[PDB]
Design a protein around this ligand. Structure first.
Ligand SMILES: *[C@@H]1O[C@H](CO)[C@@H](O[C@@H]2O[C@H](CO)[C@@H](O)[C@H](O)[C@H]2NC(C)=O)[C@H](O)[C@H]1NC(C)=O
Ligand SMILES: *[C@@H]1O[C@H](CO)[C@@H](O[C@@H]2O[C@H](CO)[C@@H](O)[C@H](O)[C@H]2NC(C)=O)[C@H](O)[C@H]1NC(C)=O
Ligand SMILES: *[C@@H]1O[C@H](CO)[C@@H](O[C@@H]2O[C@H](CO)[C@@H](O)[C@H](O)[C@H]2NC(C)=O)[C@H](O)[C@H]1NC(C)=O
Ligand SMILES: *[C@@H]1O[C@H](CO)[C@@H](O)[C@H](O)[C@H]1NC(C)=O
Ligand SMILES: *[C@@H]1O[C@H](CO)[C@@H](O)[C@H](O)[C@H]1NC(C)=O
Ligand SMILES: *[C@@H]1O[C@H](CO)[C@@H](O)[C@H](O)[C@H]1NC(C)=O
Lengths: 328, 169, 169, 328, 169, 328
């Protein structure tokens, strides 16, 4: 005349490790490592821009590529692999540092620096920036002697940062294809460029020579940038070889909530298409990672709100009591 | 065809609960899952896998560039630091899981005994332990008595004297 | 106005100890905290917060300069490495505390049962468990008998036969 | 006729988290994260120096600022924010690396390198180092032609590290305000400076030009330093533009316990006042952190014997049993 | 010269096993180590120190050079990162050992009670607990009876009535 | 008439720490930290090479030192302390980065780049590379005018990477002892060297001067290297001062399993002898670390399959139950 106390069991339960022992059979278990990712960028409910052919730094100075994205507003920014930051061969000083600024910008607003010129060619064009007809960077002016081989004027410019947000200022130094071309373009004799800000000063000189032909140009243009505090003057002084900013770049996450303001973007690097139907907060080169699980084995370098990255392909988590199969 | 409890065995038969009662008496054999202790085990188990999130999730950005490589001297260090940190986080996740796992396995064993101890104490002197997790009852317990043992209303005085004669001679 | 023990309840009344005895007999009702098991729980608890120091403290120096910034390329990495290490140390402290916490809660439950098991074994066949953590005593136990149960001198033979008649009929 | 076993409880116990469950109520609890700091530097029982206006590197070469601290002895060294390492505009090569040496030095002892000169102005003075009347770095000599526009002598100096502790040696290269000023000062023609040690050799030449006017000087002086093993000669060879060490700097934690010896300092950066009444082993920009608790949420970058830094503002630690309120 | 069990004491005498039986009866005194529970404790203990390997081992290469120093700016960071990681791995090893250690100490206590509980349940109503970990047997148990208790064949019915008269009057 | 349940104990058990409590006595314990190492390199069953006097980078370009090891095949590679990568004073660009390539190479195979010359001295020899009689780098040619002070020819070379494995290419720029010596060697006038690859291009010019005399030479040779993808041309163009590769270096772990192939080496730095009798997978400057234990206190910087490094000299691990000594 009896009563028995029992617990459930199943015939074929999964094996889970514990600190004490390995591969203990149990009633139920769940995976904790996410190993497959959504190969799309999941942008639903987010404001996203695909630069595509556009290099990111190019958004600042305007090659023909970046024509769409000069004043873009974005929560999520996607760089792409074959993208070229430049139309006329050159490279940014502190380039990797400059992009990281832009990725988290929110996007960028542009306003004119107000520069005007008296006796110079400002309309400099190149085979490199074609755009219906040969052209230049959208956001800059190329300055030339206005008569070939005519010695270029010692000029000075001051621009002062009126706005509350620190401005982004970019300028160029041109290294001419030949010692001749510098002469033809900027006249002859010593060439000096100096840039002055309350925190910044430096002097640049062309070092003219042939360099391997990229985009059909032996010549190079090098871009140097600065951040200008409000109420600060950047002074531009140059006898030539100088590529001049026409517009200042302002971050959108420094705006005063005056409706330009679109705060705090995440810039990712992705090979995947876009998808406004699915949802994501974690991204990697493959696509989005969205998962109930708390770890991923997919990519070390994933960015956004992400599952922790772990070496292991599986750690299985117990969801039920230890399984003790029934006896005869 | 005798019946035993948890000590040596699991019941593949019990399929509407985690823990349960198996009985036999003059009327026959019955099995009922117990709700409260099932829910108690289940509540502690759910929220696992949500607990592991919210302990191990972070917000981060690109330090190195895949598309154009940053300088190799520094590039080497960032790879070294990243791999070393992954070793640490891997160690940690495998340990945290093995903890939460030790814990589910153990607290389940815990809920079983919580319940059996309740029942032992509930039967006082009217029953004895076979030691398979079962109680031998020295009175006549019948399907409305069994439900009393279960529903936690078994009054041991009503049957004590019967049980004591039945137990001593 | 009946009295129960730890199983279901805590005593807001017990205020000169952690664990205690509550009794009633012909003389009335008494409560005494138990010293030894209190000190045993307390000793294990103190030295917490000193244990956490001496496990987590280090000697270190300035790698980056606040007053004049070091180079930004490296500067970024040092910030990244420092934040990543903080994630690791944060995870660790929240876990170490949740361990020490699981441990205090548990060992306390442990000291209670250590004591109750002692007493059950001490009373042998003269008492029975109501199951609220209380013992029903089938002999006449009186305030000098109670102090015996407590002070660990209760001799169960002196009362056994009395208790056995009182228990069986 | 009964006996009951019980445990204490309280009406309103604090909530603590456990691995299993969250916000379990319990009888007693203590905080484990320290979140308020003492905004003073707590120097009791420690030997401390506040450089104040003094830049730290300036202790080596002696601007007027650093006049007090030329031979300082310190267990704890406090840098300050507006401090200037230099009186005449220049910067140290390997500057951040140089300071870290000094912070942990213990302080510094000075002894003369013994240099003497024959036909030169050594008394060079500047508007920049005023000090009753125009002056120079306390620990160096400024070398000039002794007659304006007179071509400067090819000279050689050898100094050898007699002492057991490695010596600290600092020297200067002067970049003159104008191409003229170099001429007026050091004469005309090629200028070369070479520094030679058994582990060290390098050659320096002035690159004279105008630079933005700081402290009223377009000219710059650049300091280069070395560590000299015992028994090693540093050889100084120069035709001009050279700023010469007068004194060698010796760390105090390399002393032989010959009572100069004051071992092993911690150099901090702090905005807080000093306080010889309170006690501290952990410091940060705000002040000292002294606490019974084992974690701090106050500052990542704190230095000294410190509580671990954690993201969290609180983790509360149980000090008593689980609280089970009393029932009817 | 009375004999006690594990509750208060360890047996320096038991030297061919981890857990054991000590008995006395009409024939005299005997001690036998118990094999199965010994092997059970031992199996869980062995594989320790192999478990710690395979959790904490890595493959790595030279990032800095001892023979010719790499640049000091970066050199400082690599030393800082390496020391900081060592702090983390040190913390971890001292914790992992203190866990595995808490675990060996505890599961041993566990195997003892597993065994004693078995025996208590095995003797049913024929024995009583002195509370030193010993059982007082109210029948005549003799060296072939003792081996039954041990070899897990003790049939409590064969001696029940004898034990019950011996226990009540 | 009784039965007792017990556990074993011993008189003098070891103390072990637990999370709860410190120095709990127990029956048995084992050490978990390894603190003594085998001061030998344990190479049993492994293919090992001791470069000895050979610097590692020297294996690529062949000083007399590295004569044995030009085409070495190794699983484990041991660098040594006084080893010199160079016979004629110079240094590799990206040197530390270059070695790490070689250490993990597996060894290296050499094949001739096929270059031939028309009107030049190619047999340039130096006091620095003695080798029976004055000599040069084994793997390079030193190119000279063939008549003293004769202006050197504008020449071009293209070599293309036929093999599947990326080739290693090394070249030299010579900075002559004096402005004279450059003239005597390479003639007079402007000297330019340009190196071109599909991913690589750069231009080098000698900057001739005296430098401190090492190996008896004031002059220096600087080595620059590149990795060449299969099917890629490196183009060499130079009017002089150029040290030319004779042989291309191919890694063995990029081989096609065509029996050159000896995959994946670990390069260590060690002061210890070699020992083919003992076995090791972890190495450090002292020797091998081979141990049953899972942690080491011996060296932070150990490499190979290694025990984790920990601050602590001991953590003792329990191997038995808590010890409870027997009572009266
Ligand atoms: C048993 O564990 C499984 C997971 O192994 C749980 O099932 C998941 O349940 C959620 C909620 O419906 C679903 O979103 C997932 O798709 C399920 N995963 C799989 C693979 O089944 C289930 O809830 C657990 N149940 C019990 C009783 O243990
Ligand atoms: C209860 O916990 C508290 C802390 O919450 C302990 O009190 C601290 O006691 C020390 C020693 O006197 C004092 O220095 C601190 O100022 C106290 N802190 C606070 C906020 O009270 C107390 O010791 C514990 N007592 C018990 C019985 O749990
Ligand atoms: C007790 O612990 C020790 C280690 O302290 C164990 O002994 C080691 O045993 C292995 C296997 O024979 C040997 O390779 C080691 O040399 C031994 N070390 C030492 C210092 O003894 C032993 O196995 C354990 N035995 C028990 C019963 O605990
Ligand atoms: C138990 O049964 C007895 C039988 O008389 C009864 O008097 C009593 O009220 C019952 N209930 C309890 C809880 O004792
Ligand atoms: C227990 O009580 C009995 C009563 O006779 C007595 O003989 C004995 O000495 C007491 N003490 C113990 C510890 O048995
Ligand atoms: C126990 O002993 C009784 C004595 O009659 C016997 O009938 C029975 O078969 C024994 N075995 C078991 C397991 O009950």
């Amino acid at each position: 005349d009896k009563i028995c106390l029992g617990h459930h069991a199943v015939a074929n339960g999964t094996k889970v490790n514990t600190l004490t022992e390995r591969g203990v059979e149990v009633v139920n278990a769940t995976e904790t490592v996410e190993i497959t990712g959504i190969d799309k960028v999941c942008t639903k409910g987010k404001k996203a821009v695909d630069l595509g052919s556009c290099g990111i730094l190019g958004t600042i100075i305007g090659p023909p590529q970046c024509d769409l994205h000069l004043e873009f507003k974005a929560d999520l920014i996607i760089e792409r692999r074959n993208s070229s930051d430049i139309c006329y061969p050159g490279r940014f000083t502190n380039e990797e540092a400059l992009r990281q600024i832009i990725r988290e910008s929110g996007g960028i607003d542009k306003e004119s620096m107000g520069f005007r010129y008296s006796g110079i060619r400002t309309d400099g064009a190149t085979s490199a920036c074609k755009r219906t007809v040969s052209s230049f960077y959208s956001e800059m002016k190329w300055l030339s002697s206005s008569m070939n081989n005519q010695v270029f004027p010692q000029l000075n410019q001051t621009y002062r940062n009126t706005r509350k947000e620190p401005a982004l200022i970019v300028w160029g130094v041109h290294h001419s294809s030949s010692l001749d071309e510098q002469n033809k373009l900027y006249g002859t004799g010593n060439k000096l460029i100096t840039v002055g800000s309350s925190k910044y000063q430096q002097s640049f000189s062309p070092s003219p020579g042939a360099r391997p032909k990229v985009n059909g140009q032996a010549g190079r243009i090098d871009f140097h940038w600065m951040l200008l505090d409000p109420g600060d003057t950047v002074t531009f002084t140059f006898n030539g070889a100088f590529i001049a900013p026409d517009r200042a770049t302002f971050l959108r996450s420094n705006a005063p909530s005056g409706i330009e303001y679109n705060g705090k973007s995440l810039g990712i690097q992705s090979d995947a298409q876009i998808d406004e139907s699915c949802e994501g907060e974690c991204f990697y080169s493959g696509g989005t990672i969205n998962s109930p699980l708390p770890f991923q084995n997919i990519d070390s370098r994933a960015v956004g709100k992400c599952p922790r990255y772990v070496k292991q392909s599986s750690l299985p988590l117990a969801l039920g009591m230890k399984n003790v199969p029934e006896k005869i | 065809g005798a019946i035993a409890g948890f000590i040596e065995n699991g019941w593949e038969g019990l399929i509407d609960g985690w823990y349960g009662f198996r009985h036999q008496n003059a009327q026959g054999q019955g099995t009922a899952a117990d709700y409260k202790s099932t829910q108690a085990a289940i509540d502690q188990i759910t929220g696992k896998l949500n607990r592991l999130i919210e302990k191990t999730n972070k917000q981060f950005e690109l330090i190195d560039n895949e598309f154009t490589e940053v300088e190799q001297q520094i590039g080497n260090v960032i790879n070294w630091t990243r791999d070393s940190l992954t070793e640490i986080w891997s160690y940690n996740a495998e340990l945290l899981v093995a903890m939460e796992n030790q814990h589910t396995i153990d607290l389940a064993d815990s809920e079983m005994n919580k319940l059996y101890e309740r029942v032992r104490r509930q039967l006082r002197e009217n029953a004895e332990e076979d030691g398979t997790g079962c109680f031998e009852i020295f009175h006549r317990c019948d399907d409305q008595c069994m439900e009393s043992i279960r529903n936690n209303t078994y009054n041991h005085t009503e049957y004590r004297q019967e049980a004591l004669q039945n137990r001593i001679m």
